[PDB]
């Protein structure tokens, strides 16, 4: 379904553009939400990827593959040994899974994606920085 | 500097100047107030280095 902003009584005061609480649409897929939900339930595992399993009108089910980064086989297996690196801790919380990357616009590259490359926030910061060099 | 405090104007009817005052009633947040900000604080964005051909 669509999202309903959590504003008490439905009132979002202020400028009229920022009114409107039902019918808003989530910025992340429900696949990304499914992976963020299993990250919080199990913060001891690292999330690799997820896939659609089934859907109904009420709910959509997705299965998420999670890795124990402290098992002997995983640590010594060169193929999955990168999940054990500390920088891959709760990757879903930093938008680093495939679904999160889609929602951040990182599946697109080239024209269309040139203001969302290091990150949307980082591009704005690199564009709006005032250089103020010494020998200006 | 001078902006770390919480001061608000006391108002217009307490027989006091409208400058911002701390909870006790102490002048604050102004060039003319002790402990207040510089009116125009000095900044490292000044061009320290000139240019020559």
């Amino acid at each position: 379904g669509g999202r309903k902003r959590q504003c008490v009584h439905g009132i979002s005061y202020g400028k009229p553009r920022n009114i409107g609480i039902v019918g808003l649409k989530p910025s992340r897929s429900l696949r990304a939400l499914a992976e963020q939900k299993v990250g919080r339930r199990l913060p001891s595992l690292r999330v690799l990827n997820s896939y659609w399993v089934a859907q109904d009108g009420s709910y959509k089910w997705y299965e998420v593959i999670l890795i124990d980064p402290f098992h002997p086989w995983i640590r010594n297996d060169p193929k999955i040994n990168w999940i054990c690196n500390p920088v891959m801790k709760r990757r879903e919380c930093r938008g680093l899974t495939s679904a999160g990357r889609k929602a951040r616009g990182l599946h697109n590259k080239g024209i269309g994606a040139m203001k969302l490359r290091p990150s949307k926030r980082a591009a704005w910061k690199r564009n709006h920085t005032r250089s103020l060099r010494r020998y200006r | 500097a001078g902006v770390q405090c919480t001061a608000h104007s006391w108002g217009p009817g307490r027989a006091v100047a409208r400058l911002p005052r701390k909870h006790g009633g102490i002048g604050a947040y102004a060039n003319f107030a002790r402990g207040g900000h510089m009116a125009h604080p000095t900044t490292v964005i000044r061009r320290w280095c000139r240019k020559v051909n």
Partner: peptide
């Protein structure tokens, strides 16, 4: 004012709050 070319300078953003949008080059000789 009178005969002047209208400035195409955008107004400073996030000047006292938010991300630091001003960079300084005193680290250049280092």
């Amino acid at each position: 004012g009178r005969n002047v070319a209208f400035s195409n300078m955008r107004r400073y953003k996030c000047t006292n709050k938010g991300p630091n949008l001003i960079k300084n080059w005193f680290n250049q000789p280092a």
